[PDB]
Short mmCIF file of C-alpha atoms in Angstrom, two decimals:
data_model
loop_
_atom_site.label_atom_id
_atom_site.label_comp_id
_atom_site.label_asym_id
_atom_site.label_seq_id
_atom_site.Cartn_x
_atom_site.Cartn_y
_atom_site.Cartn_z
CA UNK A 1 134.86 96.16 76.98
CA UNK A 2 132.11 96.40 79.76
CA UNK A 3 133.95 98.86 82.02
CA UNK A 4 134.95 101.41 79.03
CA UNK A 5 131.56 100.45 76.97
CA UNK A 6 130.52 103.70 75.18
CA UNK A 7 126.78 103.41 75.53
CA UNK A 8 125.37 102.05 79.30
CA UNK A 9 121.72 101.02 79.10
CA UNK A 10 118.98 102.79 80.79
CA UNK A 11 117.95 101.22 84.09
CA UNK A 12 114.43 100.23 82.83
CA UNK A 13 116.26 98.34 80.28
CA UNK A 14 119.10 97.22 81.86
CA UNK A 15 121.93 95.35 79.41
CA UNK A 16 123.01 92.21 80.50
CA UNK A 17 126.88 90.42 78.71
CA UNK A 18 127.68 86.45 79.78
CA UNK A 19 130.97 85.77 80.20
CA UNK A 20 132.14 81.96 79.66
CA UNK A 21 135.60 80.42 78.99
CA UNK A 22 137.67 82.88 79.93
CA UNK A 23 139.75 84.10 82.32
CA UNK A 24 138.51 86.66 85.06
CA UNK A 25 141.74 88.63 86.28
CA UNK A 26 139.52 90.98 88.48
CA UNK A 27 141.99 92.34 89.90
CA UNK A 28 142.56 94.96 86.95
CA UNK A 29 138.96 95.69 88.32
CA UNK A 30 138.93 95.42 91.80
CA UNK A 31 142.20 97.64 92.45
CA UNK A 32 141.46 100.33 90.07
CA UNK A 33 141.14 103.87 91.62
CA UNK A 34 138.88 104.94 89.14
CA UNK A 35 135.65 103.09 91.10
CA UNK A 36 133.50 105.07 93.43
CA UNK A 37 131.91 102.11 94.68
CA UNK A 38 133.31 98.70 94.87
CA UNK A 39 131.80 95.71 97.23
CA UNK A 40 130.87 92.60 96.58
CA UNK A 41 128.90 90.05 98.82
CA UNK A 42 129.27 86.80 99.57
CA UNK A 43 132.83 86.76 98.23
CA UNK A 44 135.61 88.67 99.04
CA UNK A 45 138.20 90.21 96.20
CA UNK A 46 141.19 88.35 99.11
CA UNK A 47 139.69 85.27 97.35
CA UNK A 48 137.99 85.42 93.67
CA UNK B 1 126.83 84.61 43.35
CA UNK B 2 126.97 86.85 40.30
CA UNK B 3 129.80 89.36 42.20
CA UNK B 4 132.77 86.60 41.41
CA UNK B 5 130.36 84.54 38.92
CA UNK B 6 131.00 81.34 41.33
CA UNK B 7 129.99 79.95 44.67
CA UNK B 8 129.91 82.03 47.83
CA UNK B 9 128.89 82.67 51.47
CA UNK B 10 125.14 82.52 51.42
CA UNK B 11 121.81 82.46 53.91
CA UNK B 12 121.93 79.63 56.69
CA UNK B 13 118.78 76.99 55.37
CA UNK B 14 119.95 75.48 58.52
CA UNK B 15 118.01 77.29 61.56
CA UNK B 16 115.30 79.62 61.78
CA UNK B 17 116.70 80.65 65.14
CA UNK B 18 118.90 80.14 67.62
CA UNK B 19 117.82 81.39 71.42
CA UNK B 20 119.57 81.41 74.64
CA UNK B 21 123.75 80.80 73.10
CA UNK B 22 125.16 79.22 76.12
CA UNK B 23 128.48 78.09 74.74
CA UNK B 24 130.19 79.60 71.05
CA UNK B 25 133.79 79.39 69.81
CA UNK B 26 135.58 79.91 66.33
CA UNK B 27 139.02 79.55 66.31
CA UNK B 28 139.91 78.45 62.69
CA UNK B 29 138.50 79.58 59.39
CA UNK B 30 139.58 76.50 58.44
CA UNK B 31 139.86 75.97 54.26
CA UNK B 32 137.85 72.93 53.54
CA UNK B 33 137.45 73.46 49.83
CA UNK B 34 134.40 73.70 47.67
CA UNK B 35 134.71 73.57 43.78
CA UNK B 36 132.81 71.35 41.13
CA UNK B 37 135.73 68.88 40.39
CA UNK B 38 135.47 65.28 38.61
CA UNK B 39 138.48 63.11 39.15
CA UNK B 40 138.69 60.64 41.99
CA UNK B 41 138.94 61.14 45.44
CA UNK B 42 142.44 62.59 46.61
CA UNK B 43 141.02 63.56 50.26
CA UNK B 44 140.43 61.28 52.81
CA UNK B 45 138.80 63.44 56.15
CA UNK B 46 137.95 60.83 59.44
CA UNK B 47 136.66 62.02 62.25
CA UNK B 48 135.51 60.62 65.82
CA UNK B 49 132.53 62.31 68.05
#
């Protein structure tokens, strides 16, 4: 849902989602080419 | 309800509100039933916390 959401927020009013009980595949995320930025900090996408 | 002249779905008189939602599930909409009835009890539900 997030990545394809139809309506972002505006900065001011930023949206935050919480995600719980689930299972986080990011890499469907953190291989897409679609990104024009990707980094993270403090982890590395070798390891989450 | 006067739409099926019976019981239905109706406002929560349980909570005014309900901040901060830091777990939720569903799964089931499991069919515990609902209706007037006057014989003795056939169902027997136990349940441990």
């Amino acid at each position: 849902e997030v990545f394809n959401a139809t309506r972002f927020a505006s900065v001011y009013a930023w949206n935050r989602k919480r995600i719980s009980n689930c299972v986080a595949d990011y890499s469907v995320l953190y291989n897409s080419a679609s990104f024009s930025t990707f980094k993270c900090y403090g982890v590395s996408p070798t390891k989450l | 309800h006067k739409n099926n002249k019976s019981w239905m779905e109706s406002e929560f008189r349980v909570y005014s509100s309900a901040n901060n939602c830091t777990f939720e599930y569903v799964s089931q909409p499991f069919l515990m039933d609902l209706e007037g009835k006057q014989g003795n009890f056939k169902n027997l539900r136990e349940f441990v916390f």
